[PDB]
């Protein structure tokens, strides 16, 4: 529709606005754009006790959104909160993904299922199953340049030689593992270049950082004048 203005709108209305945006993108399979908003939405909301509940909602969502995009969110952020007990099932989601252990993630979502359903994080959890598996094989690829797919099957307790192939094969379409499978030399061999300093990539990062910085220089400049003007209207020496 596009008509959502920014002209005079309260900070209460924007803060709620961004929370909704995060939810709406994630169920329709966009994760990229949900990151920016889930972070924005924490920042506009204040950090009071009467508001603590809203922050608990945001913090639960921040785990799913981040993980599906394929970046692990801070262990630290959930550790060193007071919200740690609410985010206790959610800490256990993050640890499962980290270790790559399938068995762990399945156990978590069974025990805490009633809690997860209220907050509406559970539907997102069915999808987070997929993330657990890729991490388990991701781990093996970094450690081990050449390992036979026979050995990969034993380790993550997979069913056959065909199973192990089809997970790894999809992982490389999206480029997450980044390897090559050899079925006629009987091992998987990593094709990792693993350098980004002799890529045109740094150019692209620095652009965001510079644009944000200038953005703020203008925001200081504009704001500064308005109180100065008011004191000038009032009589003083």
């Amino acid at each position: 529709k596009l008509e959502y203005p920014h002209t005079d709108v309260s900070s209460s209305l924007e803060a709620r606005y961004f929370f909704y945006l995060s939810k709406i993108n994630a169920i329709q399979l966009d994760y990229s754009t949900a990151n920016e908003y889930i972070i924005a939405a924490i920042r506009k909301a204040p950090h009071n006790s009467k508001s603590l509940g809203f922050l608990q909602q945001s913090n639960k969502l921040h785990c799913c959104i981040q993980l599906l995009m394929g970046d692990i969110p801070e262990l630290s952020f959930f550790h060193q909160s007071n919200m740690q007990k609410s985010l206790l099932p959610y800490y256990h989601l993050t640890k499962a993904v980290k270790l790559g252990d399938l068995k762990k993630f399945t156990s978590t979502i069974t025990k805490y299922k009633q809690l997860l359903l209220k907050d509406d994080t559970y539907q997102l959890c069915v999808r987070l199953r997929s993330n657990v598996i890729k991490t388990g094989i991701r781990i093996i690829s970094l450690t081990y340049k050449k390992i036979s797919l026979r050995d990969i099957c034993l380790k993550l307790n997979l069913d056959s030689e065909q199973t192990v192939e089809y997970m790894v094969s999809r992982a490389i379409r999206d480029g997450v593992i980044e390897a090559k499978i050899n079925h006629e030399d009987g091992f998987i061999e990593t094709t990792e270049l693993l350098n980004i300093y002799d890529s045109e990539d740094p150019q692209q990062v620095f652009d965001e950082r510079i644009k944000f910085a200038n953005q703020l220089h203008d925001e200081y400049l504009v704001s500064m004048r308005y109180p100065e003007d008011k004191k000038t209207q009032q009589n003083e020496k």
Partner: protein, 304 residues
């Protein structure tokens, strides 16, 4: 004679006079002002102090028919030396509006007078270019075979300016401009970079058309000229090599520094904000004292 002259720096006054002289003698195209050029030389830095007009009539029916006032030159040389001794005959200007093959007949007359090779300043007098329209040529003599045995030819030298305290300020004083040949600030260097690209495209056409005229409008094949052209192509950069890659790594370093330098500036700008709100804070206490004084003032108004 000496061929040791690597730059010519010309004062604003020399340019301004010779140009000024063109309409003071009320000459129009195909009639020439020439004048005497006075200044320093025998050095790498040529420093062009002053100039004065001569009468000059050009007949172009025969380029062997020319007018030059001989006596005028000797007389004038001696008077100028009594104001300032650093004035010597260092050449003569030709008023343009282009180079000719004919300027060499005239140059011989000026070798006579001088102990340096005469500078031939072709001052183009309609004024084309976003640069200076002043060319400098000094006749250089060297043995060379391009259909000749001993060549006299004219080698270009750079034209730039140098000015005194007084003269610079007098230029600035005329001008309502802030300059843009300076390459000082960010703003100025932006303007320049675009002027540089436009400078480059226009010269390339002149090279492109010259070559069309040999091969289709039939001038002769000049091996020596082409030869020079060939090397342009030989010393070109070639990318898709590690050379191209060193550039990529270079870009990264400079843009990283721009970000880190910019982050410093994010503290500077933000810090100041707090200081103003301090000034606003103070101005309300001051305004309160005023507001009290003005409460009292209103009772007087009622009373009176």
């Amino acid at each position: 004679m000496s061929l040791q002259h690597e730059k010519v720096t010309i004062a604003p006054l020399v340019l301004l006079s010779a140009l000024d002289h063109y309409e003071r003698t009320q000459t129009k195209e195909n009639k020439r002002c020439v004048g005497v050029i006075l200044g320093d030389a025998n050095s790498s830095t040529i420093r062009v102090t002053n100039s004065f007009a001569l009468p000059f009539e050009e007949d172009e029916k025969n380029s062997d028919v020319w007018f030059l006032d001989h006596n005028y030159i000797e007389n004038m040389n001696e008077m100028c030396k009594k104001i300032n001794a650093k004035e010597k005959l260092i050449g003569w200007y030709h008023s343009g509006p282009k180079l000719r093959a004919s300027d060499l007949k005239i140059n011989e007359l000026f070798k006579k007078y001088t102990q340096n090779n005469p500078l031939l300043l072709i001052v183009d007098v309609k004024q084309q270019g976003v640069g200076l329209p002043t060319d400098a040529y000094v006749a250089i003599e060297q043995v060379k075979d391009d259909g000749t045995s001993t060549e006299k030819t004219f080698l270009h030298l750079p034209c730039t300016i140098e000015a005194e305290e007084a003269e610079e300020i007098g230029v600035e004083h005329l001008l309502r401009d802030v300059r843009d040949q300076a390459a000082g600030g960010l703003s100025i260097r932006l303007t320049n970079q675009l002027k540089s690209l436009k400078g480059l495209q226009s010269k390339l056409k002149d090279v492109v058309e010259y070559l069309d005229k040999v091969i289709n409008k039939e001038l002769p094949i000049n091996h020596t000229i082409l030869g020079k052209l060939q090397d342009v192509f030989n010393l070109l950069p070639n990318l898709g090599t590690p050379d191209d890659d060193e550039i990529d790594v270079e870009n990264h370093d400079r843009i990283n520094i721009s970000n880190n330098l910019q982050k410093a500036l994010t503290v500077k700008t933000n810090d100041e904000l707090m200081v103003i709100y301090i000034s606003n804070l103070v101005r309300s206490i001051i305004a309160f004292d005023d507001l009290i004084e003005n409460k009292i003032q209103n009772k007087k108004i009622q009373e009176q």
